[PDB]
Design a protein around this nucleic acid. Sequence first.
RNA 1: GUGCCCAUCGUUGGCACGCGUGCA
Length: 910
Amino acid sequence: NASETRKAYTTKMIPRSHDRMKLLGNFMDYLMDGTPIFFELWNQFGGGIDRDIISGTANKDKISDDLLLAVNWFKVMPINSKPQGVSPSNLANLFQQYSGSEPDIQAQEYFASNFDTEKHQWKDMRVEYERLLAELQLSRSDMHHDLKLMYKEKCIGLSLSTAHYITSVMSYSAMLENALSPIKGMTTKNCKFVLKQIDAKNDIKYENEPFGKIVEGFFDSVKWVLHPHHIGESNIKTLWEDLNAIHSKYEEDIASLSEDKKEKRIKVYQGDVCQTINTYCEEVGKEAKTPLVQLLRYLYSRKDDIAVDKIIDGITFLSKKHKVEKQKINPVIQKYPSFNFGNNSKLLGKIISPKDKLKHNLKCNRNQVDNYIWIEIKVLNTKTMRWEKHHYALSSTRFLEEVYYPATSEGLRKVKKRQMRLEAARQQNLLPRYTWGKDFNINICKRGNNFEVTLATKVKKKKEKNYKVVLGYDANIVRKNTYAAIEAHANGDGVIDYNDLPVKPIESGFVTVESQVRDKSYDQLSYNGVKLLYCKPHVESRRSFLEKYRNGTMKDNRGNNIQIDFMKDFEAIADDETSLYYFNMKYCKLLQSSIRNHSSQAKEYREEIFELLRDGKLSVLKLSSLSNLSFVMFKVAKSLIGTYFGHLLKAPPITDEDKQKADPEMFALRLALEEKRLNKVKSKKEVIANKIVAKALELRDKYGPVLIKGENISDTTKKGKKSSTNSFLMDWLARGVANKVKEMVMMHQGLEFVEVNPNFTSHQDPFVHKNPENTFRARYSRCTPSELTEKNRKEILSFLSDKPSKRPTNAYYNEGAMAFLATYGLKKNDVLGVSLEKFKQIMANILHQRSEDQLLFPSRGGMFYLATYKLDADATSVNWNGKQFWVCNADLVAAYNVGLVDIQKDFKKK
RNA sequence: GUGCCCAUCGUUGGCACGCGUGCA
């Protein structure tokens, strides 16, 4: 209803007058050097609190007295700091000495919380409070009364007030907000951290610690965290059932036939178990992350030592323990200041704005208006100890285009264009008035010999509720991220009722950014690179590089062979049909594998990485597509360089500084590429948000307010999803997209963001699933018989296998395969046979009989999901048996179902 | 003002965006 948000334009300061610039710099340095004084002083006041002083409202959600008090006078400050004097050993008795308090679990687990002893350490804040009292020559009773009074006005402890009220009751304000900002933020973060840990520490079994260490022996059999997704929590039971069945088939072969042939028996037993676990991970890997075969075979090798239901407990115990032991506490560190400036209660100072800029340009020999901004900032000069309002220059061209241009009429190539383009507006008479208002909270920070002013501003929303329309999007890396907008109560072709209202499918399509080019119109979100029509030299250089390397060893069958200059994937990656970005991704994966094997000779693997990233004309850094597999290219590049460092020095662990010292250029390259990927993921977030909000505006001007149906992880205390799908979702910070989209929702009037978990959003048939009854129809892959392969027939016939389908997806694909047989009359006896050419011929005959020409068969890695209505807007009415379904696009139907998931609640009939 | 896209880097190339606490 009332949610204001900030917006800054990251302006740039210019040195215009050395004397005044240095005066402002001296004032800023004065305030910056005075800020640590207030930081230490407020630490001193905070540490002085004692029990019986919080005996007021006591309005905390679940924070006990012990935790609040300990955290408020126990903190982890940098090692090189005055408050030193305590060690992490005697913490319990130290707390006991203060007010005779018993350290309970609530406070103990805070105490029993690890920190980074390399740079931080615990500080007393109580003997330091006594030191402050002594240095102030004030009685302990007086200081205690003063701090109690301050806490009464919420001026110390948890959730302090703003510097305005503080200083009013207690130039000082701005340096104060750069001092107690950490004292206010880190305290709350730590208290919530301890709450979460206690809520996730007691829940740990505490009885399987023996089995936990037993399984942890796997690592001692770089270190990474173990999680339940490494086993397939609910399916390893069936895996061991099958392995037990095999063992019974091996007990007879072991007790009997003990001659010189049981060596082959044990070899085939090992092969059978390894291949069974591999098939187990692959089949479950089609819906989740494939468990590491190495871990599974290791644990099976210790099957006897662990019971059937003890492996699950051990792995979950390890997950909980190793996420608890890597989640650290928040150290209250010296905050760097920023010194915001505002026109309401901060240090008085103002951007002048356009009408006044025109006034001051007319009084001088300025043509009509200058390309820079002038800000009047109140600098308190020290030499002349007084405040003067001095004018300084900002150069934010974007700001000029946005709000800093008047309505007269209604290396520098790029930048100059923006002003000239904006200059043309002065003579085209198009730009509307901006209604300055002068409500900008300009921020001025001093790092070195420069400044980074921003000109922040506050924008209100007044969010609406009557969402006449809804919108959803996929935000996945499968392929073709997409969106779909659905109306609520329309009356037309689509009057499809869900429970009590006709949700009409308005539109649905892939969301791709438009980036016009001299001769084409590419899409950053899905370009996938060029089709290698002109990029022959780049791939040819890659071929020349990889021609001189013999081969590598795989792990599918524990053996591989080569003679000389054997290839790995060129025959299936050097095709002009393949996209450039995918080619680079595959090449980077191949190099990652090569270094994984060829580790000793890493000295020769630096020029190539440079070429793919810096030196190559079509380098990864230069040319890339802001495509879902594009982030895959950068992730594989990061992993490639990390593994290159880890396999060049092949043993204490090697840190970032070791990488610096070993090779300076490579480490700088990894940092540059990480920055590239960080700002590029920011770019994808903002661009997808911009398109979604623009299409939301389209709907708003068409019909009305539109929701977006995003995905949330925290702030709901549900977390019904496991860490498995949580990680499978949060990749490439998908939430960030949603996050960005809600931040922009804070300004684009009429929009509104609501997030819904990713559950029940995989194969649901839109508008019929959970409308009358659960449907959960499967996906397929429309295609002609002329381009089938072994995989398609293998997959469809595998769907026909009748067993205990633990995963509902397998059962639903079984039902889909039965429906496919009914539609085609495949004669399962003959359909489940070999010679896929026979199946293709039968499909061709069926298509010749029917009027249709392209066949339609179920599959997993396939698009063209079947819907019962017109969704894709290009769907054809294909009859399955007698159902006259619509062959829409799988991605669009996924966009449809990920939307409206909880519309029955997000859009109640209130 | 930072950035993103490009066989070629401009046709006056196209386009986007909040800077700073914890998010995998």
